[PDB]
């Protein structure tokens, strides 16, 4: 569902990947759960460069899977961590967890349609 | 306290239930905690059916105990779940956690008035 | 920094404290975390007087370290708890967790500037 998922991106991806598509949804969830775990760890440690790195990785994985609002927040975190501006990091991690839970349920529902 | 609790639902329940009333405050809290744990488990499984049927009971339990804002969220989650419109489920669950925490402390305050 | 930290309260404190300044950043984090844990335990017990007493301490400790928005939420909790008005307690505790998370990462950033 828009505006959380850009059907543009995912319609093309499903068409190419065929039975790999359900594996990409499952993998996206696992890889994003590990990214969020890494961001919380980086936030507690006050590790700006780890926040920036992981944010940038997450931005790309989000964009690959048409999770465009999630990739937006990842970009914000990457750019502010790059400035050393960390005030917003807790609230952006929160925004990422609330947006990621939408994408996760949408992916778990779409996954159910496949064997 | 309005708008969280409808004092006239509760005043009627007090008058009817007499000595049972404090026991109902206590079991509303434990029952609702369990219903929230089951909604989280249902959301992490992507089980729209388990979301729908836990939301509908919590709606009634909330209604029964004059928690009318909490009941209005449960109603929204039940309907969402029945339709399969899961994009709102994470946000509605969090709204039901923040509104239940209000009801919980009001009911713990009220329970202190009884042996 | 602003509006979360009043930099001049802190500029005066580091001028006075010199070498002890980084210890105070560390201490403030640990003191504040234990007081949040105390607030949550008081909220789950429906203990208005524990909420009021811990809220008052935290207001002072926040104020001493230029965390003026955090101290504002603590003041709101102290005043409402004294009046036995506990309907806003859950929300105010959550506002103090989100604001504290900002002060925490800014203090962990600054602490890395010292041995």
Residue numbers in the entry:
A (entry chain C), B (entry chain B), C (entry chain A): 2 to 116
What does the paper say about this structure?
In Pseudomonas aeruginosa, an important opportunistic pathogen that causes numerous acute and chronic infections, the hybrid two-component system (TCS) regulates the swarming ability and biofilm formation with a multistep phospho­relay, and consists of hybrid-sensor histidine kinase (HK), histidine-containing phospho­transfer protein (Hpt) and response regulator (RR). HptB, the target protein in this work, is closely related to biofilm formation, which could increase drug resistance and protect the cell from pinocytosis by the host. According to previous studies, after the sensor proteins PA1611, PA1976 and PA2824 are auto­phospho­rylated, the phospho­ryl group is transferred to HptB and subsequently to the downstream RR protein PA3346 as illustrated in Fig. 1. In this work, two crystal structures of HptB and the receiver domain of HK PA1611 (PA1611REC) of P. aeruginosa have been determined in order to elucidate their interactions for the transfer of the phospho­ryl group. The HptB–PA1611REC complex is further modeled to analyze the binding surface and interactions between the two proteins.
